[PDB]
Amino acid sequence: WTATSGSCKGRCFELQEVGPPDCRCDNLCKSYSSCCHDFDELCLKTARGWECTKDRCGEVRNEENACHCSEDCLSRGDCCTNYQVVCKGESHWVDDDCEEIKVPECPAGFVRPPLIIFSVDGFRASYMKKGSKVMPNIEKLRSCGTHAPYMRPVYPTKTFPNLYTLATGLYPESHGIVGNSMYDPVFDASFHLRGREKFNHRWWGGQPLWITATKQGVRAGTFFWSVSIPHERRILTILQWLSLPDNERPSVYAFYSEQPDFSGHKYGPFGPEMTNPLREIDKTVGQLMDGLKQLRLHRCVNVIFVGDHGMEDVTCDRTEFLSNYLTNVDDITLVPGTLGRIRAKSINNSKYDPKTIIAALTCKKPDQHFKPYMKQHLPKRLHYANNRRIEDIHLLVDRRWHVARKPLDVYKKCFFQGDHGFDNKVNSMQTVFVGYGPTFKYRTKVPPFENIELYNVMCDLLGLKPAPNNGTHGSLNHLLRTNTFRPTMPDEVSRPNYPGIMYLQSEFDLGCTCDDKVENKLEELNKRLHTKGSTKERHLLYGRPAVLYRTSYDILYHTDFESGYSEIFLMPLWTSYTISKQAEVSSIPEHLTNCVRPDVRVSPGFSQNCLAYKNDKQMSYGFLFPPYLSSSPEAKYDAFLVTNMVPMYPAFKRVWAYFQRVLVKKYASERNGVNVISGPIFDYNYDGLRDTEDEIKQYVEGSSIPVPTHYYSIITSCLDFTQPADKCDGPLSVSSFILPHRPDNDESCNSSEDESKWVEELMKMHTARVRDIEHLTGLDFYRKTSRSYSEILTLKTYLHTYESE
Numbered sequence: 148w149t150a151t152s153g154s155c156k157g158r159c160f161e162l163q164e165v166g167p168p169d170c171r172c173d174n175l176c177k178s179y180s181s182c183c184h185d186f187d188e189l190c191l192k193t194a195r196g197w198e199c200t201k202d203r204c205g206e207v208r209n210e211e212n213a214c215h216c217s218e219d220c221l222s223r224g225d226c227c228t229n230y231q232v233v234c235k236g237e238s239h240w241v242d243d244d245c246e247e248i249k250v251p252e253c254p255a256g257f258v259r260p261p262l263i264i265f266s267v268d269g270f271r272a273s274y275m276k277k278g279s280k281v282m283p284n285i286e287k288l289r290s291c292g293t294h295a296p297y298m299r300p301v302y303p304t305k306t307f308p309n310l311y312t313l314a315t316g317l318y319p320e321s322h323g324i325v326g327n328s329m330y331d332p333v334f335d336a337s338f339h340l341r342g343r344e345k346f347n348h349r350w351w352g353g354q355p356l357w358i359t360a361t362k363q364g365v366r367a368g369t370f371f372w373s374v375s376i377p378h379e380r381r382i383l384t385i386l387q388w389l390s391l392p393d394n395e396r397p398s399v400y401a402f403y404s405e406q407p408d409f410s411g412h413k414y415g416p417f418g419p420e421m422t423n424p425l426r427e428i429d430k431t432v433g434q435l436m437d438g439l440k441q442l443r444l445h446r447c448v449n450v451i452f453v454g455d456h457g458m459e460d461v462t463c464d465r466t467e468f469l470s471n472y473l474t475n476v477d478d479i480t481l482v483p484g485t486l487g488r489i490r491a492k493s494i495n496n497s498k499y500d501p502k503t504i505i506a507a508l509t510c511k512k513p514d515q516h517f518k519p520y521m522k523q524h525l526p527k528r529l530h531y532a533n534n535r536r537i538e539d540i541h542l543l544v545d546r547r548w549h550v551a552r553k554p555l556d557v558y559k560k561c562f563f564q565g566d567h568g569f570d571n572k573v574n575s576m577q578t579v580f581v582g583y584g585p586t587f588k589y590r591t592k593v594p595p596f597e598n599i600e601l602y603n604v605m606c607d608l609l610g611l612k613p614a615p616n617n618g619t620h621g622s623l624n625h626l627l628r629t630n631t632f633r634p635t636m637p638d639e640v641s642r643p644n645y646p647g648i649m650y651l652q653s654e655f656d657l658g659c660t661c662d663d664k665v666e667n668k669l670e671e672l673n674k675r676l677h678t679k680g681s682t683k684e685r686h687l688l689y690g691r692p693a694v695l696y697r698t699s700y701d702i703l704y705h706t707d708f709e710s711g712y713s714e715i716f717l718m719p720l721w722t723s724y725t726i727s728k729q730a731e732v733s734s735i736p737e738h739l740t741n742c743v744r745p746d747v748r749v750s751p752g753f754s755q756n757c758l759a760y761k762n763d764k765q766m767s768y769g770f771l772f773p774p775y776l777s778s779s780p781e782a783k784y785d786a787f788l789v790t791n792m793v794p795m796y797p798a799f800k801r802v803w804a805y806f807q808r809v810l811v812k813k814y815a816s817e818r819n820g821v822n823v824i825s826g827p828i829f830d831y832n833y834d835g836l837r838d839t840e841d842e843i844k845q846y847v848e849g850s851s852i853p854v855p856t857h858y859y860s861i862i863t864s865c866l867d868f869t870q871p872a873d874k875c876d877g878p879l880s881v882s883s884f885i886l887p888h889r890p891d892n893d894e895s896c897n898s899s900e901d902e903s904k905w906v907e908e909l910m911k912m913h914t915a916r917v918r919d920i921e922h923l924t925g926l927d928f929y930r931k932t933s934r935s936y937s938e939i940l941t942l943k944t945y946l947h948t949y950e951s952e
């Protein structure tokens with residue numbers, strides 16, 4: 148109940164919420180059905196529109212007008228935004244030459260440059276180029292400030308998950324807004340875009356920017372605008388707040404536009420109907436900048452022009468129906484559209500089985516336009532699993548398509564020509580970022596980056612300490628003229644042991660055999676030098692990785708590779724090697740096919756054994772440093788050390804062998820040498836974070852050899868490919884992957900074919916940032932380079948996406 152009989156007189160868009168059932172005048176009041184009786188009359192005036200005209204100049208103040216052109220309006224802070232242009236002979240901001248803002252030029256009483264976040268829904272990255280002729284205000288912000296060619300949203304590429312990621316710096320799995328629609332089984336409650344229930348505090352995790360600000364003594368404007376407050380009124384409200392007395396005035400503000408998304412759904416991303424919404428958004432930016440110019444704030448405020456996601460061509464005819472796959476279609480609940488989430492219709496139905504649902508959805512039709520996954524098997528780069536609101540069964544839907552339960556769902560719900568929500572690496576889902584103001588750089592282009600990084604920067608812009616989040620703070624320092632955040636490298640927690648030869652061959656009873664008893668002082672000194680690290684500079688190019696947790700591990704040196712060998716997990720945490728452009732690929736000699744050799748530096752007790760693999764009828768093994776790339780017949784024996792062996796399903800060995808035999812040399816040819824670091828990952832609870840040993844769910848049968856859930860590789864070379872990887876003077880170039888360690892290749896519909904037709908495609912799908920691997924392993928890479936730490940942080944957040952231009 149609201150007692151709507153109070154009044155909004157002098158309270159319009161008040162900043163604190165009043166306690167029920169006293170009537171409200173804040174911007175959420177409409178959403179709650181709780182505004183005072185006179186809120187429309189007082190707070191949503193429209194009389195005479197939004198622009199001054201020559202005849203209104205110097206008018207007698209009429210309180211009924213939407214905005215004012217009377218002489219007193221500047222000090223009231225409520226002129227129409229074009230007031231100074233129409234009445235005082237001033238230019239529009241867009242018509243002024245771009246002039247570098249080296250320092251904040253702020254009115255007296257401003258303690259910091261305010262931040263205004265101008266957020267646009269459905270604003271696809273390519274609109275910046277393709278709509279440039281009709282967006283002069285946005286184009287000026289872009290060319291004069293700092294801009295990226297695009298900004299990567301989070302998955303799913305929907306509005307609420309992305310805007311709340313902007314607010315918090317968190318993946319949706321951590322902040323809890325995992326879709327525009329959700330069921331939480333603990334709450335037994337459902338989240339819907341319609342109504343006030345979505346406002347319930349239990350949906351919203353993390354700490355959004357307006358709460359971070361408030362907790363630290365920085366005042367915030369309210370970020371949510373009810374759909375029926377027109378854009379011109381949103382801008383006027385922000386401008387009015389900016390005229391409050393110092394002690395009352397916020398320092399951070401947000402504007403939101405539901406365009407171009409709304410029209411993009413109806414017309415498609417490039418429908419001829421899209422020109423007008425683009426022009427209208429630009430006019431709104433123009434109103435804001437003119438308004439700031441009037442308030443002498445246009446060289447004081449930092450403006451962020453940012454989108455939530457793009458927009459793809461999607462029509463009713465491109466819908467896959469689960470009723471064409473599943474016999475049991477009525478025992479499932481589907482969250483449909485550009486992604487699929489499936490769960491049981493009734494928890495009382497004990498005949499429901501995810502395994503048979505997945506199999507019925509796997510590679511069933513030749514050009515099938517979705518792929519089913521258990522959520523833990525989704526590409527780790529999506530970070531889309533660790534939340535009870537994310538259903539165990541997920542459908543990744545191809546761009547341009549939908550999935551629905553039954554045909555009747557599509558015509559009893561063609562309307563739409565555009566949609567979004569797909570994989571966040573898809574070109575059409577990319578969105579925009581521009582920063583303009585004293586704290587941003589002047590006329591500067593920066594590489595694409597992920598929207599999870601922005602919260603930290605917004606906190607920097609406001610002098611706030613960010614709450615713990617998924618950005619990598621310092622990775623966007625290159626966007627900023629000042630206020631950069633200068634992190635220190637994390638401290639190494641565990642120091643390695645450097646074992647020498649400590650065991651005789653006969654102390655090992657591992658059930659391994661090798662045909663290696665084939666027998667020189669010249670070359671004997673060499674083998675010793677190699678085991679002491681003489682080639683380490685070639686193979687460990689950026690320092691050894693730091694181990695950031697407590698554990699027991701050994702550094703092992705070899706001619707062709709170096710490794711950090713875990714005595715706890717019985718295998719390397721990492722294996723580092725360099726392959727030059729000139730390197731030759733060789734085969735595994737016939738006599739060495741099943742060769743595994745005890746490592747006399749490492750105790751039998753801390754070694755794997757061959758017998759476990761023989762007895763485990765499902766599990767085989769592979770090698771982290773590939774025998775195919777040995778530098779010489781003699782160095783090849785090192786590759787068969789038991790300390791280089793890792794457990795691998797035969798199905799996965801197909802993938803791994805093709806990567807190691809073919810693709811590594813391909814990359815070294817293409818990139819002018821590569822340095823490779825490879826290793827295992829254990830993430831049995833799918834939280835994106837390294838497992839402790841007590842979290843491991845599967846071992847090689849009859850042993851304490853843990854089975855990895857994933858294998859990673861980090862492949863580094865010189866950004867200037869005229870220099871070889873091992874003699875690189877400047878910036879680095881990286882690509883990485885985190886491949887799922889699966890007992891079948893059901894994910895790859897073409898897997899019965901030669902590896903050349905499917906393996907690299909699988910690897911591309913599982914592309915990763917170095918930072919993702921850091922989370923998953925508790926390792927810290929690139930500790931010793933000649934590069935600045937912030938540059939390395941940027942490198943660690945890089946994702947090679949494989950999309951075209």
Ligand SMILES: *[C@@H]1O[C@H](CO)[C@@H](O[C@@H]2O[C@H](CO)[C@@H](O[C@@H]3O[C@H](CO[C@H]4O[C@H](CO)[C@@H](O)[C@H](O[C@H]5O[C@H](CO)[C@@H](O)[C@H](O)[C@@H]5O[C@H]5O[C@H](CO)[C@@H](O)[C@H](O)[C@@H]5O)[C@@H]4O)[C@@H](O)[C@H](O[C@H]4O[C@H](CO)[C@@H](O)[C@H](O)[C@@H]4O[C@H]4O[C@H](CO)[C@@H](O)[C@H](O)[C@@H]4O)[C@@H]3O)[C@H](O)[C@H]2NC(C)=O)[C@H](O)[C@H]1NC(C)=O
Pocket residue numbers: 317318320321322323349350351352353530533534535615616617834835836922
């Ligand atoms: C991305 O960045 C984020 C933020 O840094 C990273 O997430 C952090 O990861 C930490 C490790 O997973 C985690 O730390 C835990 O916090 C527990 C306290 O949790 C509450 O308090 C915080 C702080 O205010 C709050 O933010 C939390 O918010 C979560 O939960 C609410 C609802 O419950 C949601 O609204 C919200 O969205 C968020 O949910 C997300 O995280 C939780 C996990 O907390 C998931 O379950 C959800 O799916 C969702 O993703 C909480 O309100 C603390 O109690 C934990 O301590 C346990 O474990 C330690 C191990 O050191 C052990 O010593 C303790 O004894 C304790 O174990 C006991 O309980 C166990 C479980 O019941 C039991 O098994 C044991 O036997 C013990 O009895 C733990 O320290 C931190 O909460 C989150 N923070 C956030 C905001 O998500 C994230 O990892 C980054 N991602 C990547 C890939 O890097």
Ligand SMILES: Cc1cc(OCc2n[nH]c(=O)n2C)c(-c2cc(C(N)=O)ccc2OC(F)(F)F)cc1Cl
Pocket residue numbers: 264266306307308309310311313314369370371372373374401402403
């Ligand atoms: C730029 C930006 C815009 C935001 O809403 C813009 C908006 N106004 N009107 C409309 O429909 N939307 C989406 C929100 C946002 C704020 C709140 C809050 N309580 O203040 C709640 C929910 C919100 O949005 C979300 F859930 F999508 F995050 C957060 C940021 Cl960072």
Ligand SMILES: [Ca+2]
Pocket residue numbers: 829830831832833834835836837838
């Ligand atoms: Ca884990």
Ligand SMILES: [Cl-]
Pocket residue numbers: 303305325326327328482
């Ligand atoms: Cl959704």
Ligand SMILES: [K+]
Pocket residue numbers: 760761762763764765766767
């Ligand atoms: K086996």
Ligand code: NA
Pocket residue numbers: 892893894895896897898899
């Ligand atoms: Na297959």
Ligand SMILES: [Zn+2]
Pocket residue numbers: 269306408409412567
């Ligand atoms: Zn939309």
